[PDB]
């Protein structure tokens, strides 16, 4: 198991004409491995569909992942904006 | 560290032979000295003056020398040409 590997490669031909959305050096960084997509960094460990209680085949499509993201209500945000000035 | 020492600068004879100061010994903002303006307590800000950076550059290293009821004042003149 090695730690001090390079894991970064840049092609010498500069085709930096229409490339401004990627991660530039400031050239294009090319890794040895792909990227990973994480939807929400917070996990609601309640919400008993995930915790599976032992009391009582059912399908249910919940609206959006934001149930599992601890999203606050807009009234507290409006109250904090009223407390801002 | 980062302290300027007290001694070992004696750039005096080059100012005696600088040919611009009013010295009759040898023949052959807008202020010059920052004794009224601050440098924000930084040493490098003293290097912008030409009469001080000349002292820092053209200095030399010397060695320290170690050594009646009515006074009679007699003026003594001196006039000797040499080299």
């Amino acid at each position: 198991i090695m730690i001090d590997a390079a894991s970064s490669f840049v092609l010498p031909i500069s085709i930096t004409k229409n490339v401004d959305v990627l991660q530039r050096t400031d050239e294009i960084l090319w890794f040895r491995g792909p990227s990973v997509i994480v939807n929400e960094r917070i996990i609601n460990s309640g919400d008993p569909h995930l915790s599976l209680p032992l009391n009582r085949n059912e399908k249910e499509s919940l609206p959006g992942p934001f149930v599992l993201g601890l999203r606050p209500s807009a009234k507290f945000t409006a109250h904090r904006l009223s407390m801002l000035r | 560290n980062q302290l300027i020492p007290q001694a070992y600068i004696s750039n005096f004879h080059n100012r005696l032979t600088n040919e611009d100061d009013g010295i009759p010994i040898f023949t052959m903002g807008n202020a010059v000295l920052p004794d009224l303006q601050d440098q924000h307590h930084n040493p490098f800000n003293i290097l912008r003056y030409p009469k001080i950076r000349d002292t820092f550059i053209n200095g030399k290293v010397v060695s320290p020398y170690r050594l009646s009821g009515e006074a009679i004042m007699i003026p003594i003149t001196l006039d000797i040409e040499h080299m």
Binding site: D4, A6, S8, P12 | Q2, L3, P43, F44, I57
Partner: peptide, 29 residues
């Protein structure tokens, strides 16, 4: 296009941990 190997960019851990960013301190004339 398959003969276009690139240049590796090293980590330089001793230059990654605590490198800073001497005539500026007046002690060497």
């Amino acid at each position: 296009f398959e003969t276009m190997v690139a240049n590796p960019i090293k980590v330089s851990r001793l230059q990654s941990n605590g490198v800073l960013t001497i005539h500026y301190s007046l002690a060497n004339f």
